[PDB]
Amino acid sequence: GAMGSMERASLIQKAKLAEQAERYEDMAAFMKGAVEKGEELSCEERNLLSVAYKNVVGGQRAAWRVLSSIEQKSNKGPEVREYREKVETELQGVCDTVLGLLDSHLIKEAGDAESRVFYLKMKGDYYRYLAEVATGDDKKRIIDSARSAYQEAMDISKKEMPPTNPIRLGLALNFSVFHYEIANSPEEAISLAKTTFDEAMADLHTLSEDSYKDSTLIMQLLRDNLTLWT
């Protein structure tokens, strides 16, 4: 694509600069270019990809929610609906781009648990974002695609990673959100968050001070959700 002529290392360097400049659209385009070079991504690189697109789609989702709220209160000419649709289509396109990178070919080359879980979690998240705005004939299939990705990620994480691993924890946090917000399964959400929290607590004794800080941060986010849901 447009980044085809730039060195991989230059793309990663520019992604880091774009992060510092809070230029997340540029950051995402740089990381897309890096992925399209065809090499596997390191841990640091995977996190740059994730930060870039989470910020892009996060803005789009926030805008969509504002507009959807206005549209629902209006139910006046076609403008609110048209503009909500425009933002929706742009959001769908970003989700499709990320899903495209994971399918071509990040997931299939990811053999280590840390990489494969990370990418399947991302796959679940971006189908979840598609689900948030879906209404048509494919909505159930979209939800099932998110569910399937999260479930594969969970199965690997349980086999291959300790209960305190931040990826394992963040995956459980977001799958529990999927259950509560998308799948109409609050009990499943609560169970998953509480079992994840408890199993992590029991493994904290194995951790260094730095690892402890990472794990307990995510555990507190699980607890915050449990407090909100109960």
């Binding site: 929610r65 998240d125 986010l221 959700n225």
Partner: peptide
């Protein structure tokens, strides 16, 4: 909406 993992 409930909070997911932040960045």
């Amino acid at each position: 909406r409930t909070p997911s993992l932040p960045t």
